Design a protein around this motif. Structure first.
Motif, PDB file in Angstrom:
ATOM      1  N   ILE A  38      -0.125   5.303  -1.717  1.00  0.00           N
ATOM      2  CA  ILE A  38      -0.087   6.193  -0.674  1.00  0.00           C
ATOM      3  C   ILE A  38       0.761   7.304  -1.025  1.00  0.00           C
ATOM      4  N   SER A  57       0.676  -1.168   0.016  1.00  0.00           N
ATOM      5  CA  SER A  57       0.014   0.047   0.032  1.00  0.00           C
ATOM      6  C   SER A  57       0.804   1.262  -0.197  1.00  0.00           C
ATOM      7  N   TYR A 108      -7.418   8.148  -4.196  1.00  0.00           N
ATOM      8  CA  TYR A 108      -7.120   7.302  -5.186  1.00  0.00           C
ATOM      9  C   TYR A 108      -6.943   7.910  -6.675  1.00  0.00           C
ATOM     10  N   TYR A 143      -3.030  11.116   5.685  1.00  0.00           N
ATOM     11  CA  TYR A 143      -3.477  10.312   4.642  1.00  0.00           C
ATOM     12  C   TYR A 143      -5.044   9.743   5.049  1.00  0.00           C
ATOM     13  N   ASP A 144      -6.189  10.101   4.295  1.00  0.00           N
ATOM     14  CA  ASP A 144      -7.513   9.453   4.830  1.00  0.00           C
ATOM     15  C   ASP A 144      -8.016   8.572   3.449  1.00  0.00           C
ATOM     16  N   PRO A 145      -7.963   7.310   3.640  1.00  0.00           N
ATOM     17  CA  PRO A 145      -8.319   6.558   2.633  1.00  0.00           C
ATOM     18  C   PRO A 145      -9.921   6.679   2.129  1.00  0.00           C
ATOM     19  N   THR A 146     -10.842   7.259   3.065  1.00  0.00           N
ATOM     20  CA  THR A 146     -12.277   7.322   2.992  1.00  0.00           C
ATOM     21  C   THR A 146     -12.757   8.393   1.798  1.00  0.00           C
ATOM     22  N   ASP A 201      -6.820   7.098 -11.998  1.00  0.00           N
ATOM     23  CA  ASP A 201      -7.829   6.153 -11.302  1.00  0.00           C
ATOM     24  C   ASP A 201      -6.897   5.162 -10.501  1.00  0.00           C
ATOM     25  N   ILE A 202      -6.478   4.858  -9.292  1.00  0.00           N
ATOM     26  CA  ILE A 202      -5.679   3.827  -8.879  1.00  0.00           C
ATOM     27  C   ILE A 202      -6.493   2.929  -7.929  1.00  0.00           C
ATOM     28  N   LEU A 203      -6.755   1.821  -8.297  1.00  0.00           N
ATOM     29  CA  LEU A 203      -7.392   0.638  -7.456  1.00  0.00           C
ATOM     30  C   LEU A 203      -6.292  -0.106  -6.734  1.00  0.00           C
ATOM     31  N   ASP A 204      -6.240  -0.055  -5.120  1.00  0.00           N
ATOM     32  CA  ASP A 204      -5.518  -0.763  -4.410  1.00  0.00           C
ATOM     33  C   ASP A 204      -6.343  -1.306  -3.500  1.00  0.00           C
ATOM     34  N   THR A 205      -6.527  -2.793  -3.346  1.00  0.00           N
ATOM     35  CA  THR A 205      -7.416  -3.333  -2.520  1.00  0.00           C
ATOM     36  C   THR A 205      -6.546  -4.247  -1.293  1.00  0.00           C
ATOM     37  N   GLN A 229      -0.033  11.305  -1.898  1.00  0.00           N
ATOM     38  CA  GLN A 229       0.143  12.219  -0.919  1.00  0.00           C
ATOM     39  C   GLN A 229       1.254  13.189  -1.485  1.00  0.00           C
TER      40      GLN A 229
END
Ligand SMILES: Nc1ccc(S(=O)(=O)NC(=O)C2CC2)cc1
Ligand SMILES: Nc1ccc(S(=O)(=O)NC(=O)C2CC2)cc1
Lengths: 449, 167
Positions: free
Chosen positions: B22, B18, B41, B33-36, B55-59, B26
């Motif tokens: 991040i 992650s 992203y 950092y607030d992932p909400t 547009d980044i998808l990191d699960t 940032q």
């Protein structure tokens, strides 16, 4: 202004400064109390048991998240030290009595909501009981007797009638015949919602704080979370397996269609975990590519499926709005919370430095406790549905993979997909039927009042 | 409107994956950092003079949901296959991740970048030459990054956008 002892004799008397404590610009919304951003452990301990007022939100947050910056054994020492307090008449009533009662409130909350700390370190409880014994005073006798009663309870560890259990081809007690198409689609969805609801409710914050489900000891520290993720994965694989092992096209269309009905009942029940288990199976590599199967699916079911898929799209934007618009009982999808907790912990520093002094970043911890609080708000309300013990045991024992490993099984599902619907231009073969019973769905409308 | 590139981060859990996304999002001097929120992203950047949105998808943290990856992988235009240079199993897991991406996309030529992440001061067990060889065998670029210093982060993501543009 009161006269407090020197820091040499009592560390908690040291005054506030930019080197030992900092605050957010806003106040606690319902309490008008300042929100602590960061401080030294001595300062966080002071504000946890502050004389001017009680701070239940800070107490709750602190006790859920303190283990990253302070060990349970160290916390007990700090709160014993805080209680042992060395003009005199007002000091005894406006500093000593409030502080000593706030220390006992912390003890009480710790043993009540985070007893696992005591279960895991018998010496921690030895010391709590020792300290609680040395507490003398009429003002504390009521709170000392409450702590003792909670300890002994922890040491020795509601609606109207639910709807009628639905039945299709398999009749009650005939477990041997239970399967996707023989059990009632409403009852599959109800019994899975009940299993998933209990799996969701069993996950405790101690399995989440510190991202412990991702670490080497995840099996020791996050067993309930992992059983909930494994059930979910198992159901998705079972749906995929049911589909691709139905080689006959008409029967396979019946299977896909019945699964989209189970999804519709999952949506009606607000079981978002179940909805996403279905969506995940439909979007898998073996199932996604079955164009001849989906061509024969009724438009109504394609539309039900299409809207359920959209809940996931764009970082769960629609899912999140939907979950926020409903009220319990519901079964949320846990994955979003897992990513949010992990990224909050990895994207924020453990410590802030002010004038060369290290301060524990408490805001980072508050953010995590806010996510864990959101998980807990959906864990209180049960579903008004009756358990069917045999259908329950049928779903608890599902093992689609058998003895195969993930890759081997997943390669097998994909090779089955290619056999039943080869890649273009290869023509579509025909396959014999496997189901001796009728494929007509009973529907998802409850067959009884 | 400007081009939007949908990027997907894949890799083993438990090894600081992650930090890649991040650190990108940032600023190199901001660390709150607030992932909400949506901005965590999404990032507007300029690459080779051409402005675009990533547009980044990191699960990260959802690795146990092993039957949900295909849904994420099919939409993604480009992939960052991330491993930790101090964890050989994470390096060895890459092969199955790439295989799943090829299966989902139904293609052997998918815009992909291999990323070796230096997530801590613990000893290196994956040498750059092993990763460079693996990357060359797949026909993709290799980029090493540091989770602590932000070194290589921008190059990992930009190299991937160039891989998509040249697809
Ligand atoms: N970059 C990217 C990749 C994939 C997508 S998605 O809509 O396919 N899935 C999701 O967002 C999943 C997490 C809900 C979006 C953006
Ligand atoms: N389609 C549907 C919607 C809701 C459900 S239920 O089990 O939540 N409630 C009932 O059955 C009520 C009628 C008794 C089942 C199927």
């Amino acid at each position: 202004q009161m006269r407090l002892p020197s820091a040499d004799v009592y560390r908690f008397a040291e005054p506030d400064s930019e080197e030992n404590i900092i605050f957010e610009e806003n106040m606690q919304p319902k309490a008008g109390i300042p929100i602590i951003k960061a401080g030294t452990v001595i300062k966080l301990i002071e504000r946890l048991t502050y004389h001017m007022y009680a701070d239940p939100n800070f107490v709750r947050t602190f006790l859920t998240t303190y283990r990253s910056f302070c060990k349970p054994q160290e916390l007990l020492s700090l709160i014993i030290e805080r209680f042992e307090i060395p003009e005199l008449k007002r000091f005894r009533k406006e500093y000593i009595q409030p502080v000593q009662l706030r220390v006992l409130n912390v003890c009480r909350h710790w043993v009540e909501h985070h007893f696992y700390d005591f279960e895991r370190d018998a010496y921690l409880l030895q010391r709590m009981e020792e300290f609680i014994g040395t507490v003398r005073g009429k003002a504390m006798k009521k709170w000392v007797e409450s702590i003792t009663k909670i300890i002994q309870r922890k040491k020795i560890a509601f609606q109207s009638s639910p709807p009628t259990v639905e039945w299709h081809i398999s009749r009650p007690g005939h477990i041997e015949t239970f399967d996707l198409l023989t059990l009632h689609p409403i009852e599959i969805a109800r019994q899975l919602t009940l299993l998933e609801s209990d799996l969701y409710r069993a996950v405790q914050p101690s399995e989440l704080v510190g991202s412990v489900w991702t670490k080497e000891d995840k099996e020791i520290n996050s067993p309930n979370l992992l059983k909930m993720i494994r059930h979910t994965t198992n159901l998705t694989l079972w749906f995929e397996k049911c589909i691709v092992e139905t080689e006959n096209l008409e029967e396979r269309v019946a299977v896909v269609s019945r699964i989209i009905e189970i999804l519709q009942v999952f949506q009606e029940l607000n079981n978002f975990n179940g909805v996403l288990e279905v969506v995940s199976a439909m979007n898998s590599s073996p199932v996604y590519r079955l164009d001849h199967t989906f061509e024969q699916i009724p438009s109504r079911q394609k539309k039900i499926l299409e809207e359920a898929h959209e809940l996931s799209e764009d970082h769960y934007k629609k899912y999140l709005a939907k979950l926020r618009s409903i009220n319990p009982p519901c079964v949320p999808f846990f994955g979003i919370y897992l990513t949010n907790i992990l990224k909050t912990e990895e994207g924020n520093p453990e410590v802030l430095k002010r004038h060369g002094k290290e301060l524990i970043n408490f805001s980072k911890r508050r953010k995590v406790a806010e996510i864990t609080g959101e998980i807990q708000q959906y864990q209180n309300q049960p579903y008004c549905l009756r358990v069917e013990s045999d259908i329950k045991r049928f779903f608890e024992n599902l093992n689609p993979m058998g003895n195969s490993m993930e890759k081997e099984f997943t390669d097998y599902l994909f090779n089955k997909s290619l056999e039943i619907e080869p890649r273009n231009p290869k023509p579509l073969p025909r396959f014999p039927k496997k189901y001796s019973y009728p494929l007509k769905s009973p529907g998802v409308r409850p067959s009884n009042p | 409107h400007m081009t939007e590139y949908k990027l997907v981060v894949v890799g083993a859990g438990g090894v600081g994956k992650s930090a890649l996304t991040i650190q990108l999002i940032q600023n190199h001097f901001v660390d709150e950092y607030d992932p909400t929120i949506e901005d965590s992203y999404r990032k507007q950047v300029v690459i080779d003079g051409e402005t675009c949105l990533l547009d980044i998808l990191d699960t990260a943290g959802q690795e146990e949901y092993s039957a949900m990856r295909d849904q994420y992988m099919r939409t993604g235009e480009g992939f960052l296959c991330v491993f930790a240079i101090n964890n050989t199993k994470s390096f060895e897991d890459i092969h199955q991740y790439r295989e799943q991406i090829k299966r989902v996309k139904d293609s052997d030529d998918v815009p992909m970048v291999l990323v070796g992440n230096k997530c801590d001061l613990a000893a290196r067990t994956v040498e750059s030459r092993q990763a460079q060889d693996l990357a060359r065998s797949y026909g993709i670029p290799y980029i090493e990054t540091s989770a602590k210093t932000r070194q290589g982060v921008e190059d990992a993501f930009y190299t991937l956008v160039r891989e998509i543009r040249q697809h």
